[PDB]
Amino acid sequence: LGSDQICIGYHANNSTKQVDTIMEKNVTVTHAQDILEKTHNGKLCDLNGVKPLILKDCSVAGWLLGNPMCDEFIRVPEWSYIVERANPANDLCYPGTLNDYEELKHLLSRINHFEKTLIIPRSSWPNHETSLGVSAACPYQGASSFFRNVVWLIKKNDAYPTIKISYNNTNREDLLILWGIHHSNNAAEQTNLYKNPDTYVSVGTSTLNQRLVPKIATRSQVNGQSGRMDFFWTILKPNDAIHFESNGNFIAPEYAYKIVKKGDSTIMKSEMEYGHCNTKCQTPIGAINSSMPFHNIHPLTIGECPKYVKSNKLVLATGLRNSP
Amino acid sequence: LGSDQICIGYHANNSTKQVDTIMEKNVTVTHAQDILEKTHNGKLCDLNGVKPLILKDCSVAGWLLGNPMCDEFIRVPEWSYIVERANPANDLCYPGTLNDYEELKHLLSRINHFEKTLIIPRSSWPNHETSLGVSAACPYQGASSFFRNVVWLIKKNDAYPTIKISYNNTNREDLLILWGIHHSNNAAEQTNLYKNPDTYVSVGTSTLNQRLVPKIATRSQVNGQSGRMDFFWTILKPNDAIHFESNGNFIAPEYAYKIVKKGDSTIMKSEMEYGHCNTKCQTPIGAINSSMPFHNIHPLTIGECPKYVKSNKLVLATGLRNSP
Amino acid sequence: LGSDQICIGYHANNSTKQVDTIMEKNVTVTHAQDILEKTHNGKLCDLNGVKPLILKDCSVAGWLLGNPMCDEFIRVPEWSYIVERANPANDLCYPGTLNDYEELKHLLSRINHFEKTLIIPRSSWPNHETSLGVSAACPYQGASSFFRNVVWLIKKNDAYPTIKISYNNTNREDLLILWGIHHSNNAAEQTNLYKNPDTYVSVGTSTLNQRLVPKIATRSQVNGQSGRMDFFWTILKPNDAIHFESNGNFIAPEYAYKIVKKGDSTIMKSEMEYGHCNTKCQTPIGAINSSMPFHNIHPLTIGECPKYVKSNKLVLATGLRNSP
Amino acid sequence: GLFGAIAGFIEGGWQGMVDGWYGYHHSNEQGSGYAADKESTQKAIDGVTNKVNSIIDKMNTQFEAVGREFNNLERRIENLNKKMEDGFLDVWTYNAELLVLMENERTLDFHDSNVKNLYDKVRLQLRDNAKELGNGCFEFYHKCDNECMESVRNGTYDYPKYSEEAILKREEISSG
Amino acid sequence: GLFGAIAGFIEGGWQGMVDGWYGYHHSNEQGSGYAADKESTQKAIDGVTNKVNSIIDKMNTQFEAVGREFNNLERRIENLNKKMEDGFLDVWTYNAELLVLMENERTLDFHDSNVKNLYDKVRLQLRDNAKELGNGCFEFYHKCDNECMESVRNGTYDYPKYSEEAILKREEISSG
Amino acid sequence: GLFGAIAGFIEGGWQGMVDGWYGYHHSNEQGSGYAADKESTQKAIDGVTNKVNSIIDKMNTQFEAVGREFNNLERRIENLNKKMEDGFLDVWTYNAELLVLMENERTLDFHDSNVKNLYDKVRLQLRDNAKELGNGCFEFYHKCDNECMESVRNGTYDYPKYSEEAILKREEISSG
Ligand SMILES: *[C@@H]1O[C@H](CO)[C@@H](O[C@@H]2O[C@H](CO)[C@@H](O[C@@H]3O[C@H](CO)[C@@H](O)[C@H](O)[C@@H]3O)[C@H](O)[C@H]2NC(C)=O)[C@H](O)[C@H]1NC(C)=O
Ligand SMILES: *[C@@H]1O[C@H](CO)[C@@H](O[C@@H]2O[C@H](CO)[C@@H](O[C@@H]3O[C@H](CO)[C@@H](O)[C@H](O)[C@@H]3O)[C@H](O)[C@H]2NC(C)=O)[C@H](O)[C@H]1NC(C)=O
Ligand SMILES: *[C@@H]1O[C@H](CO)[C@@H](O[C@@H]2O[C@H](CO)[C@@H](O[C@@H]3O[C@H](CO)[C@@H](O)[C@H](O)[C@@H]3O)[C@H](O)[C@H]2NC(C)=O)[C@H](O)[C@H]1NC(C)=O
Ligand SMILES: *[C@@H]1O[C@H](CO)[C@@H](O[C@@H]2O[C@H](CO)[C@@H](O)[C@H](O)[C@H]2NC(C)=O)[C@H](O)[C@H]1NC(C)=O
Ligand SMILES: *[C@@H]1O[C@H](CO)[C@@H](O[C@@H]2O[C@H](CO)[C@@H](O)[C@H](O)[C@H]2NC(C)=O)[C@H](O)[C@H]1NC(C)=O
Ligand SMILES: *[C@@H]1O[C@H](CO)[C@@H](O[C@@H]2O[C@H](CO)[C@@H](O)[C@H](O)[C@H]2NC(C)=O)[C@H](O)[C@H]1NC(C)=O
Ligand SMILES: *[C@@H]1O[C@H](CO)[C@@H](O)[C@H](O)[C@H]1NC(C)=O
Ligand SMILES: *[C@@H]1O[C@H](CO)[C@@H](O)[C@H](O)[C@H]1NC(C)=O
Ligand SMILES: *[C@@H]1O[C@H](CO)[C@@H](O)[C@H](O)[C@H]1NC(C)=O
């Protein structure tokens, strides 16, 4: 009816999405975009197509030394990370110690090939007693036994002749070897078990030069045992040899492990179980799949992850101010 | 006389405050605002309502072992952080060593409850001599004495019978225990003090398994003493027991400390004294009270602080350009 | 022909330089400016006018102990950083060990003054044999010899009388001292070399209190030697004295080094050679001279450097959009 | 900040314009309707999604990772890791929050400028041929049909054509 | 950057305007005086203090702390801590210096846009009823009393009212 | 973002203007030519190089440095250093990439505003003495020689002088 018109304007829609701005808060807008990743799948997954090593009720130590309840094993022989329960129930059945445990675990966190092999058989201790090295602390089928991958040698007849043995690694691969020494409780036990009262365990490679001596003393019971067993380890390079010598208290290797390492990783503490998935970024409460630059799920990631922040939203405006 | 007018304009004032800008420097402006915190109160304060433990002329070690000049003590029994002088004069009166000292100090930096208790009394060494374990290195009222919380046992008659004692922690609380061993200087001193020439000190808990042996050798005098005393410590969990055995050179616990830890902190080096204030953020040269996001006072903060920078000003413009 | 005109405009040129913008890519522009430093001179240089210590085919250890192929030395006596080859060929000729090696290297990375001095001469071992402490592992002029700065003492006549010697540092300067102990292979070698079968090495200062005992055991050959030599070090403060005692297996100091430290640095691994230049910022593949705030040459810098990034360009626009 | 007007001299937005982000609403005797500035909208859609993608793509250093491996007598070293971990979290947290805030301010006034640049394209084409109502509209002095309406929408309006019919309607409005 | 004019087409600010940040100076036969745009000044006071508060409040991760605990044979680890401590200081130092610089540039041209948007609010209300002197003032063709002066200060000026009186004063200035 | 026009109402730049960054092209009967706004170009050269210098100079904490010193049984500690090293590289890398992007956006629209502020300086000097062609040019209604041309280039153009000569040419273009 009146004069003709043309207006300039801009669109608007039903969006309730809000955004903030250095100068203004809670500004409604056409379209927006959260760049903060907030979701995970609730699962333990492979890491770039490699399954992790999930010890169930075992510690790395229990697993390696072959605690009788960990040899529910058969595996692996390759993994991207390790996952332990917070308090795995089967650690060192016979109480004691594994030297440089933490560094060992780190070394073992991501392994490219791993294989148990018989290194010195139980039938190469003709003058010592192999089958009596057993304990109620460390039981299997109701019968009491011991770490399966190592041998608690005791005296035969009334003698413990001095052991001088050596093993040459003739494999392509580095190999990881564990032995130990037993700390007895008093003069009687040490004689009863080993005859000789003043004993040692010495170990040499091209690198290693150790000599261990049992501390005979009184300690409080752990798993009903005041005795104590300290273990040690080394990586015997190909074509090197390890040299053992002992006149008592020796906990001798039977099996050892072939290892090849090329890559680092770490140990995850989580109560979950394998979820038959795959991810680039794993957390203890679940895996994250995104290209978003930040996340807020969990700080202990392993993988290639967005950057962890204390934030609930990172909302970027793409549209315009939206009026009523 | 002429036509009517109306101008649009903006204000200005006598402000000399200057600001910088990516494209321009030294630009005068109406109002501004430094966001860089630059002041502190010059005082050592409580940290969220908890007094720190200010050792005056004592080291943590002197304090714990009860160096005769540190037992001018009466305290505490709770603290948020510890402050030491740079070179506290009363450390180890009798020269030596405290094992894992640095880790121990860290453990003790913030403590929720701390209480000295008599753990084994001097009247439970009937066959040894308690009151002769004393030294000119380590004097009190001009008379020479020794660390008050531990006992330098020596031979009685011409004998040092072998000690086998144990103590069971029957308290609710973890407790921190210290003992030591004495390194004598030659065969004569060792016989003179302990009779037996070849001696040891062994110590066991459910966790600990140590055996110490004195190094009898020649060392340069410190506080006029070539002898040396090495101390050690453990945290005995409730219901565990510690087991001591020694035929010589034993520096035995008398007192121990109940501890409950829930929180971490650290050790501040500062020459100041308690200022009867409270703060959220403490530095060695004074406490800072602000909500400003950056500061430049001092890098060794303890508390919840702004972020340290190398800067003298962070001035934000709020007003407009101010003209002549 | 038509009316007069005046246009407002802006310039343009034949620049092809491109720039990016949060909202636009590959935008051509008049002038631009890379703020990412991408070049280095390909040389190992002095660091603020101080030449680095470039061990050629020697390790720090070989160099300090005076391995017969490292005493191609004459130097230094000041340096800003050290550069080692990745695998220097002359380390420990006689196989073994240098304790706290890594910390020692760190201490020595930047040294303000360094000077070898005769501390105890070979002609002060009248009752022991100095010139027979020699090995094929460790040859010089085709003749077999030994670390030059230390002395492998062996028995004289059929005796190794107990050594009690001491040295007082009477210099202005701290001094760095090294000694060692020899681990023999069996009862025969030990008797053949030292007579006494049960030996020790004890060492004391005001600070140090050590006692070393040889492990007599079987080890695999390295440089054709199953024997093993462990070395140790200390910094003897001015006016303090070091006290040695041993009845066998002692590798005794002859020379020691005066040191003054005031500044920290580190160890560079590089295969390059001195380029007779000077820089503020050195990398293992060359030195960088710039005031640019970022670089991408190499992460292992030593000096005052720009900040390392994963980036190929950081191009800032200075000009305007350049049209066709 | 604000260029002339989004929520300024242009009170609100066309709920009914659905073919773009910025455009024009006309009315004449032939009818009325919305029509988006296709070309102008595409510029902004590109700029904006380019902004978001840059913020994502430049992170392009994610790397590799871990948790918690020191023991009960390595508390000092663990505390060092804590400090580092916390320190980075504080840095990334602040940078992201401010990035978002700052970049939203700039996204909104980007839209503002785009619109104001359109008002101005039109304003400089008509002039005394129409009244600047000042609410973002123009009241034509002459009569402007749909073929004419499109000629301003595409920057080809013919001033010399109607500058006459207009002069005439100004001499009508300055009288009864 | 610069919008039209703070130190542009408006050399200088009203030393005498003391009730706000942006406003108007008039002169007519009743007198002359300054009067701030209350509403427009409050917008800016809000935006600016909102900026400052955001810069402060988003840090909202302060955390917890320490000094210096490694010993004489742990120099390597201490150096690690040095590098970390220095590294954060370098990062926070740079981010803060540039934040301040960049955000000051933008605070100043914010004020610029606020003023220019005011010139434009007034300009689009009067038109041929006043001359754009171009120094930031308007010379009225008609006579504008204080009740009139306030009617432009609050966006309710009545164009259709005074057109009458103005066209007449243009035909006076183009003659004797 | 875009102020009126760089690649807006002024398609393209003067390949032939070589004495500055912004300026004027004239044509009259005496001839035609380019001439840069010396004063306006220097402002921008100063602002821009000040920006670059600030980005450099504020880093002003470079500090001091190292490589790789932990051994085969100190892998945990080395991994701590790795994380730290990588962490700082991720932070600096992102902050630099975005700084560049953001600051380039702003450098370009700085130039845009500078130009538009020049159009406006000239526009507010002439008025009804010239036609706003809307492509960035002004068609003089009167005749403007080189002495006149320079008088606008330096902000001393004499409006009261050429009125009428213009009013006269408007009454010629509105007739046949
Ligand atoms: C573990 O066993 C292997 C093999 O039995 C040892 O390596 C072998 O070392 C010999 C010499 O020590 C190598 O020599 C080769 O033959 C003759 C020997 O007279 C020599 O003259 C030649 O020049 C040639 O190199 C031999 O290649 C090598 N064998 C293999 C299969 O690698 C190794 O030393 C043993 N480890 C220890 C600690 O004994
Ligand atoms: C340190 O403290 C106590 C000594 O009182 C020891 O724990 C206590 O052990 C007794 C038996 O050894 C527990 O006895 C309880 O009642 C009967 C009576 O002997 C017994 O047959 C039951 O088996 C039952 O457990 C008693 O519960 C327990 N006390 C507490 C408060 O837990 C403890 O073993 C000593 N620690 C060490 C390391 O020696
Ligand atoms: C290592 O050697 C130095 C001397 O070469 C020792 O320091 C010196 O100690 C002597 C006394 O032992 C000081 O004697 C001075 O002379 C007069 C003479 O009667 C005396 O009355 C003064 O009171 C004064 O003490 C001498 O000044 C001092 N000199 C220096 C440079 O220290 C040092 O104690 C020796 N350290 C060891 C561990 O043997
Ligand atoms: C811009 O607008 C004009 C408005 O008329 C368009 O002109 C019409 O274009 C169509 C399709 O080519 C013709 O069939 C009509 O007859 C035209 N009408 C008139 C009056 O010219 C023009 O096409 C538009 N230009 C562009 C490039 O899209
Ligand atoms: C907005 O401006 C107008 C004009 O100055 C004001 O209108 C006057 O209001 C008073 C008070 O109610 C009346 O008595 C006058 O007659 C009005 N004057 C005119 C010229 O119409 C109005 O008050 C202003 N509003 C505010 C809130 O200040
Ligand atoms: C701005 O331009 C004008 C010309 O438009 C310059 O005026 C000339 O100045 C001198 C005085 O020394 C006279 O002799 C010339 O005749 C003037 N020209 C005209 C047309 O009158 C003026 O110098 C310039 N201003 C500045 C500050 O550079
Ligand atoms: C992760 O999500 C992306 C798209 O965001 C998808 O392409 C991909 O299939 C998902 N990954 C897995 C393992 O399913
Ligand atoms: C800190 O200073 C503020 C003012 O800046 C003051 O209000 C407050 O009371 C002070 N805090 C304490 C704990 O004394
Ligand atoms: C850095 O480069 C400049 C040349 O632009 C030169 O003057 C200076 O000497 C260089 N510095 C070094 C240490 O080579």
Please check whether residue C306 is in contact with residue F59, taking contact to mean a CB–CB distance below 8 angstroms: yes
- Coil vs helix vs strand at B19: strand
Closest-CA residue of E relative to B293 is E56
Q: Establish whether residue D146 lines the binding site of ligand 4, counting it when its CB lies within 6 angstroms of any ligand atom.
A: no
Mapped onto helix, strand or coil, the DSSP state of residue B282 is strand
- Strand ranges across the sheet with F31-36: F31-36, F22-28, C5-10, F137-140, F130-132
What was the resolution (in A) of this experimentally determined structure? 2.8
- A 10 A CB-CB count for F172 gives 9
Parse chain B into domains and list their residue ranges: 1-50+273-324, 51-272
Q: Is E154 in the pocket of ligand 5 (CB under 6 A)?
A: yes
φ/ψ (deg, to 5) at D169: -75, -15
Q: In what order do the strands lie in the sheet with B267-269?
A: B53-54, B82-84, B267-269
Whether ligand 1 lies within 6 angstroms of the CB of A206 is answered as no
Q: How many CA atoms lie within 13 A of F34 on its CB side?
A: 16
Q: Which of E55, E63, E81 sits opposite D86 (nearest CB)?
A: E63
Residues of B with Cβ-Cβ distance to E138 under 8 angstroms: 5-7
Name the residue with tokens 């297996």.
Answer: C249
Is any ligand 3 atom within 6 A of the Cβ of residue C170? yes
Give me the residue label for tokens 């996340």: A295
Q: Which residues of C touch A (CB under 8 A)?
A: 95, 97, 183, 215, 217-220, 222, 228, 230
Measured distance CA(B234)–CA(A187) in Å, rounded: 26
Q: How many CB pairs under 8 A join C and D?
A: 17
Instruction: Tell me the residue type at A195.
Output: K
Q: Which residue has the tokens 């199953």?
A: C226
Kindly list the distances between the CA atom of residue E147 and the CA atoms of E28, E38, E153, E157, F42, in Å, as whole numbers in the listed order. 11, 18, 10, 10, 46
Contact by Cβ (8 Å): A288, A139: no
The rounded distance, in Å, linking the Cα atoms of D21 and D14 is 9
Q: Is the C-beta atom of D156 inside 6 A of ligand 4?
A: yes
| Count of other CB atoms within 10 angstroms of residue D125 | 18
Q: Give the H or E element holding residue C61.
A: helix C60-65
Q: What's the CATH code of the domain at F31?
A: 3.90.20.10
Task: Find out whether the beta carbon of B16 lies less than 6 Å from any atom of ligand 3.
Answer: no
Residue B14: other Cβ atoms inside 10 A: 7
How many CA atoms within 13 Å lie on the side-chain side of A131? Answer: 3
Dist. CA A183–CA A199, nearest whole Å: 10
* N residues, chain C: 324
CB A241 to CB C220 under 8 A? yes
Tally of domains within chain D:
1
CA distances to D99, F6, F13, F115 from C19, rounded to whole Å, are 21, 17, 18, 21
Residue A184 backbone dihedrals phi, psi, to 5 degrees: -80, 170
Enter the DSSP assignment of F36: E
**Cα of E121 to ligand 2 centre, how many Å?**
89
B76 upstream amide cis, omega within 30 of 0? yes
C57: left (phi > 0), else alpha (psi -120 to 50), else beta?
alpha
What is the H or E stretch that residue D162 is in? Answer: helix D159-162
* Rounded distance between C-alpha atoms, residue C298 and residue C38, angstroms: 10
> Residue B223: left if φ>0, alpha if ψ -120 to 50, beta else—which one?
left
Q: Is E16 exposed, middle or buried (0-12, 13-18, 19+ CB in 10 A)?
A: exposed
How far is it, in rounded angstroms, from Cα B64 to Cα B138? 15
Given a contact cutoff of 8 angstroms between Cβ atoms, the answer to whether F44 and F36 are in contact is no
Cβ of C206 closer than 6 Å to ligand 3, yes or no, is no
DSSP chain E: ---STTTTTS-S-BTT--S-SEEEEEEETTEEEEEE-HHHHHHHHHHHHHHHHHHHHTT------------TT-HHHHHHHHHHHHHHHHHHHHHHHHHHHHHHHHHHHHHHHHHHHHHHHHHTTSSTTEEE-SSSEEEESS---HHHHHHHHTT---HHHHHHHHHHHHHHHT--
In this complex, do A22 and E48 lie within 8 Å of one another by their Cβ atoms? Answer: no
Encode B76-104: b = buried (16+ Cβ within 10 Å), e = exposed: eeebbbbbbbeebebbbbbbbbbeeebbb
Sequence-distant (≥ 6) Cβ neighbours of residue B28 within 8 angstroms:
B15, B16, B17, B18, B19, B321, B322
Quick check: A226 and A180 in contact, CB under 8 A?
Answer: no
Beta strand B96-98 pairing with B228-236:
parallel
Task: Specify the DSSP class assigned to residue C295.
Answer: E
Measured between beta carbons, which residues in chain E are less than 8 angstroms from residue D77? 77
Query: Phi-psi bin for A36: left (phi > 0), alpha (psi -120 to 50), beta?
Result: beta
Measure CA C59 to chain center. 7
- Expressed in angstroms and rounded, the spacing between residue C169 Cα and the centre of ligand 3 is 12
Distance from the Cα of residue A67 to its chain's centroid: 15
Secondary structure E strands in F53-165: 130-132, 137-140
Q: Which domain holds residue E99?
A: 1-176
Residues paired with residue B260 on neighbouring β-strands, in sequence order:
B113
The chain F residue lying nearest B21, using CA atoms, is F51
**Residue F10 neighbours by CB under 8 Å, 6+ apart:** C8, C9, C10, F115, F135, F136
The position carrying tokens 């100079």 is F57
Identity at C51, one-letter amino acid code = K
Interface of E with F (CB under 8 A): 1-4, 8-9, 76-77, 79-80, 83-84, 86-87, 89-91, 93-95, 97-98, 101-102, 105, 132, 134, 174
Ligand 9 centre from C304 Cα, in Å? 15
DSSP state, residue A275: E
D80 phi and psi, to 5 degrees?
A: -60, -45
**Cβ(B278) – ligand 8 distance below 6 Å:** yes
Decide if E134 contacts E9 (C-beta within 8 A): yes
HSE-CB of B36 using CA atoms within 13 angstroms: 20
Q: Which two tokens stand for residue B145?
A: 């004495």
- CA torsion angle for F41, F47, F50, F51 (degrees, to 10)? -120
Map tokens 């000789």 to a residue.
Answer: A196
Written as one letter, the residue type at B9 is G
Alpha carbon of C233 to ligand 7 centroid (Å): 58
Cα–Cα distance measured from residue B196 to residue B187, given in angstroms and rounded to the nearest whole number? 10
Task: Identify whether the C-beta of residue C27 lies closer than 8 Å to the C-beta of residue F45.
Answer: no
Q: Which residue has the tokens 């006596």?
A: C77
Contacts of C8 in chain F (CB under 8 A): 10, 22-24, 115, 118-119, 122, 136-137
What residue spans of B132-186 are helical by DSSP H?
none
Nearest CA to ligand 7 atom 9: A289
Cα diameter, chain B? 126
Inter-chain CB proximity E61 and A310 less than 8 Å:
yes
Which chains form contacts with chain E, at 3 or more CB pairs under 8 Å?
A: A, B, C, D, F
Two tokens, residue C211: 């006692």
Give chain B's contact residues with A (Cβ, < 8 Å). Answer: 164, 166, 202-206, 209-211, 240-241, 243, 245
Report the candidate in C248, C252, C151, C129 with the shortest Cα–Cα distance to residue C197: C248
- Distance (Å, whole) CA A152 – CA A68: 14
- Chain centroid to Cα E132, Å, comes to 22
- Identify the CATH assignment for C1-50+273-324 out of 3.20.20.30, 2.60.120.10, 1.10.580.10, 2.10.77.10: 2.10.77.10
The Cα D133–Cα D126 span in angstroms is 13
- Cα–Cα nearest to C83, from C60, C111, C102: C60
Q: Which residues, 6 or more positions from C300, have their beta carbon under 8 angstroms from its beta carbon?
A: C268, C269, C283, C284, F66, F67, F68
Residue E37 in tokens: 């745009």
Q: Compute the nearest-CA separation of C320 from chain D (Å).
A: 18
A232, A179 in Cβ contact below 8 A?
yes
Structure tokens at C277: 């230049």
Whether the CB-CB separation of B47 and B80 falls below 8 Å is answered with yes
Q: Which helix (H) or strand (E) holds C28?
A: strand C24-28
Smallest Cα distance from E24 to chain F, Å: 20
Tokens (6 digits) for C269: 């691994």
The answer, yes or no, to whether any atom of ligand 2 lies below 6 A from the CB of B241, is yes
Residue D27 to residues A105, D32, D162: CA-CA distances in angstroms? 78, 4, 18
Between β-strands C228-236 and C154-155, what pairing exists: parallel, antiparallel or unpaired? unpaired
Nearest protein CA to atom 1 of ligand 8, as residue: B289
Residue F72: partners with Cβ closer than 8 Å, 6 or more residues away: none
Task: Pick the closest to residue F43 from F110, F116, F123 (CA basis).
Answer: F110
Peptide bond into B222 cis (omega under 30): no
Closest ligand 9 atom to residue C45 Cα is: 13
- Nearest alpha-carbon partner for E140 in E27, E4, E38, E17: E27
Q: How far is CA A105 from CA C59, D3, D76, in A?
A: 31, 62, 20
Label the pairing between strands B281-283 and B302-303: antiparallel
* E36-42 contacts, C-beta under 8 A, 24 or more apart: E36/B11, E37/E118, E37/E153, E40/E114, E40/E118
* A50: nearest Cα among A248, A280, A213, A298: A280
Residue A76 preceded by cis peptide, ω within 30: yes
- Domain C51-272 fold is Hemagglutinin (Ha1 Chain); Chain: A; domain 1 (3.90.209)
Pick from E22, E16, E13: nearest CA to E45: E22
Sign of the alpha-carbon torsion through B223, B225, B228, B232: negative
Terminus-to-terminus CA distance in chain D, angstroms? 45
